[PDB]
């Protein structure tokens, strides 16, 4: 029933630049033993959450000196400097002094790095699946920065948007890049009546579009 506020909700920052997260408690996080039980935890994407800091300023094993945790009673801050791609993930504060113990709403660490161009590959529908009433032409666009990109499917000249679905990734933890998958699925029928297929895609990198088309010849 204790409140903890975490700001900002997301923090853009650059590799090599310092970070700071202030966690705010609605009341005292100090224990009667004077020990205030404030943890920080990090959850990289896909991975499970992990203990970093376990008692305001006490680093947990593995975790390097670049991570700092300060704080008194309302105000606590996690400061992380010499910022890596690995720093990526969600950072959460957790109080265990009085019950029920509670978490902060997390803050997304954002890294700003060097512009990277996207790598596109178009993949034509599968044999087996084509023999399954369906036909899907799935494209890929990998390792780009910024996360801002545009992609369209032409089917003999025109554009396709109908029901289309692209899927992004959270910034890589090694190169800190984003990636995206677009699928262009319909029916065999319609796939059975268009020959070539184009995977168009514009990005801040290239003044010219990024295209990955393919014929049915």
């Amino acid at each position: 029933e204790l409140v903890m506020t975490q700001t900002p909700l997301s923090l853009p920052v650059s590799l090599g630049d310092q970070a700071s997260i202030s966690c705010r408690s609605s009341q005292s996080i100090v224990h009667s033993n004077g020990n205030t039980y404030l943890e920080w935890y990090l959850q990289k994407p896909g991975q499970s959450p992990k203990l970093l800091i376990y008692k305001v300023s006490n680093r947990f094993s593995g975790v390097p000196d670049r991570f700092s945790g300060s704080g008194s009673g309302t105000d606590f801050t996690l400061k992380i400097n010499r910022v890596e791609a690995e720093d990526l993930g969600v950072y959460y504060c957790f109080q265990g002094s009085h019950l029920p113990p509670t978490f902060g709403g997390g803050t997304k660490l954002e890294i700003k790095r060097a512009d990277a161009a996207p790598t596109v590959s178009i993949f034509p529908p599968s044999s087996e699946q084509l023999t399954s009433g369906g036909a899907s032409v799935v494209c890929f666009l990998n390792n780009f920065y910024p996360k801002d990109i545009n992609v369209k499917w032409k089917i003999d000249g025109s554009e396709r948007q109908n029901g289309v679905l692209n899927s992004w990734t959270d910034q890589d933890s090694k190169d800190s890049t984003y990636s995206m998958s677009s699928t262009l699925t319909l029916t065999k029928d319609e796939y059975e009546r268009h020959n070539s297929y184009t995977c168009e895609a514009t990005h801040k990198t290239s003044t010219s579009p990024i295209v990955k088309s393919f014929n049915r010849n």
């Binding site: 039980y37 935890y41 959450p49 376990y54 113990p101 978490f103 709403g105 699946q129 990734t169």
Partner: protein, 221 residues
């Protein structure tokens, strides 16, 4: 070597109940206490409950009347029922271990991988692997890019593995969205052109919700 494992039903029906057990190893529940943390979809960590190493349980206020952490010291298991399910009860259910001193844990020490719980009407629809191999028309340089578009499953989640795990070289995963009431995800893995079609690549999909797994081999065309 300490481990914490979670098992569950993948899905469950709106308004019914759910229990998830935490299989544990390397330590004991007599000596230790484990918390129950959870993560609503696209939301942040949510404390569910605790069981101190002495049969005692303290709960999350907002659902203690739906919570109930049990345990079997001899069986090293940490069960957790949870009556009258609901649709925002959808979360990942981790079992974390106590690292602090006595009756005040310094922090949740070791966390399980996590059991996923989906609350909806819809039923377990199994997945459909389709490999994403490049055509014959286009070619590639120094490195190639392939993947599998794993389509039509319910409920979440699935898990792909490239070349028996001997791959990790440029592996991207693209989250799954719904479509026709079904999830659909894709995995891409980039490998040196000297290796494909040169050597035998393969994609292996786990999806415990229906438990089934399909490993595909990639051939162009």
């Amino acid at each position: 070597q300490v481990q914490l494992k979670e098992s569950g039903p993948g899905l469950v029906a709106p308004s019914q109940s759910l229990s998830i057990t935490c299989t544990v190893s390397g330590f004991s529940l007599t000596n230790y206490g484990v918390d129950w943390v959870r993560q609503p979809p696209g939301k942040g960590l949510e404390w569910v409950g605790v069981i101190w190493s002495g049969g005692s349980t303290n709960y999350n206020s907002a659902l203690m009347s739906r919570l109930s952490i049990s345990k079997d010291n001899s069986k090293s298991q940490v069960f957790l029922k949870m009556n009258s399910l609901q649709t925002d009860d959808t979360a990942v259910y981790y079992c974390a271990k106590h690292w602090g001193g006595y009756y005040i844990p310094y922090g949740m020490d070791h966390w399980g991988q996590g059991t996923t719980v989906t609350v909806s009407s819809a039923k377990t629809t199994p997945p459909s692997v389709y490999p994403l191999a490049p055509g014959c028309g286009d070619t590639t340089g120094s490195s190639v890019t392939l993947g599998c578009l794993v389509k039509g499953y319910f409920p979440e989640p699935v898990t792909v593995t490239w070349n028996s795990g001997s791959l990790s070289s440029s592996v991207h995963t693209f989250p799954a969205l719904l479509q026709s009431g079904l999830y659909t995800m894709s995995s891409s893995v980039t490998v040196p052109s000297s290796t494909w079609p040169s050597q035998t690549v393969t994609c292996s999909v786990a999806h415990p919700a229906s438990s089934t797994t399909v490993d595909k081999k990639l051939e162009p065309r």
